[PDB]
Design a protein around this ligand. Structure first.
Ligand SMILES: *[C@@H]1O[C@H](CO)[C@@H](O)[C@H](O)[C@H]1NC(C)=O
Ligand SMILES: *[C@@H]1O[C@H](CO)[C@@H](O)[C@H](O)[C@H]1NC(C)=O
Ligand SMILES: *[C@@H]1O[C@H](CO)[C@@H](O)[C@H](O)[C@H]1NC(C)=O
Lengths: 221, 221, 221
């Protein structure tokens, strides 16, 4: 009857400290005649019952969106511990189990190059800052933006694209007020990837990124 | 029960006169006992005979795949003509009428900007050239790289991504060797979208464009 | 009789995800008459028996010095959760309970400024890079040196010093060869602090960071 959908945690809440990691073993299409879904967890074999019991959520099509969330510590998740999720349901003929861990494979150091806007874009009242993050592995990666140590929110991030060499790459455009950009403000693009040292790196740009030694040869007629 | 997958025309072919759109209805999962299938084309309810049928190929799973392509006028697709492929077979109780047409989404023109590689990437053996396309609507765009008219092959392109203004945007990275880059080869990225004037535009770069040094001329009065 | 010194994890380990933090429960002046040691740990009163105990060793003073390493996850120490170590020694009148936790107080975001080497440094073969870090709170902070994504080891860091306004400040001197610094090799300062956004900040520092040399040419014909 009911099916099971397993979701690995996002890179954001497992690659950095102040957001806890949590694996999302979800059960779907649980009908009204068997609302009980039992949550059992294994992390590299040892049974753990510290998961939080999210109560059942009804659905429009008379099913159940019941979610099992397992609290994790970051280091062991980085070690690829397998999450055996044991779920037993009355309409389920047997206890259905699913497994997931860290996406294995040789990690690649994500080279981060932050590119300035093109000169022709400076005509428009809004300006775009781009952050190429290329040559990484796996696709688990997050990119944010910040200026003066405070995050920005008018940015978007394109999904990763497979590269020829077996790596991946992605871009992220931060659109800000052009007035804030011409004032010499500094913008820094943050990259959180497992291969990085301390699982974090940063690069920055300013208005005066490409510039000689201030040869301000100005002609007035 | 055989099913039909309908191919919309590629945006590049619809928006380029030299190329041509190919609306195609694809018939799959046809048992070998009854591979006789006929297609009835109705362009706004008009039976048309121009359809061409390619040779059929057997699938690995002991089913058959008989295909029929249809070259079409550019204005007919650009004006949202209703396209119907009526699939008839002895193994289907009812004909399949899948209709395909272009959307009426108010098209907003893009604003192509392309950026030279960052100074950090100049050290690596290969540089990356990005052709950002921003602000367009709808999401049908093909981006092509080339140098001196020869279309470059080794390049990738991110899928269109929604923005905060309701439009779309995308990038495209070209894997060009650093040795070819430093000689100043001129590379041009091509943007093909229906909202453009003539439905085509391009931007070309060189080391001179976006050079790290810039004599700040400030020709003012 | 025997005494107990309790030590917190080093700021680097608790401040970055790459390493592990340990709360140390040292027992000193442990006589050979009753070498019995018992290690208990309360995490907000929650007993945990995951601790690792190193074997005993002999000092100059005819006693052992055993320790109790306790491996914890970073968010728990960063949450201010209380920790306690109980050691039951027969000679002492009662087993001694010692508590430890995060140094509380309103967090202050560190401000990072990089100062290029003085004009007197180019005479010597090894210039000094200074990463001023000031105006933060509390004194748990790690500073590392990175060049093109790789750490440097020829660096030192002053302990935090009380400032005028109650905050702390510390510097860090990275010694590089004058050839590398004069080659335009990029250098940046990494700061691990609990009050920073994503617990990380970086500041670029180069020859181009200095050398403003306003070359202001004008022509008013
Ligand atoms: C350079 O000249 C321009 C044009 O006169 C002026 O606006 C600008 O302030 C000058 N900058 C410097 C650093 O002298
Ligand atoms: C470069 O020239 C432009 C155009 O006049 C001017 O606005 C800008 O301030 C100049 N840059 C510097 C650093 O002076
Ligand atoms: C540079 O010179 C320009 C005119 O050439 C002047 O407007 C500007 O104020 C100067 N900037 C300085 C001296 O910083």
């Amino acid at each position: 009857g009911p099916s099971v959908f397993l979701f690995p945690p996002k890179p954001k809440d497992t690659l950095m400290i102040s957001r806890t990691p949590e694996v999302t073993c979800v059960v779907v299409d649980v009908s009204h005649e068997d609302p009980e879904v039992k949550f059992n967890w294994y992390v590299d074999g040892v049974e753990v019952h510290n998961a939080k019991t999210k109560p059942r959520e009804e659905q429009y099509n008379s099913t159940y969106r019941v979610v099992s969330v397992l609290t994790v510590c970051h280091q062991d998740w980085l070690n690829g511990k397998e999450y055996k999720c044991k779920v037993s349901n009355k309409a389920l003929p047997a206890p259905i189990e699913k497994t997931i861990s860290k996406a294995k494979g040789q990690p690649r150091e994500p080279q981060v190059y932050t590119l300035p806007p093109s000169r022709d874009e400076l005509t428009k009242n809004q300006v775009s800052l781009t952050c190429l993050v290329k040559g990484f592995y796996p696709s688990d990666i997050a990119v944010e933006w910040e200026s003066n140590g405070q995050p920005e929110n008018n940015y978007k991030t394109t999904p990763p694209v497979l590269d020829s060499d077996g790596s991946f790459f992605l871009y992220s455009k931060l659109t800000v007020d052009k007035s804030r950009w011409q004032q010499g403000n500094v913008f820094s693009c943050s990259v959180m990837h497992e291969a990085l040292h301390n699982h974090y790196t940063q690069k920055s740009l300013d208005k005066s990124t490409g510039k000689p030694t201030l040869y301000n040869v100005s002609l007035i007629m």
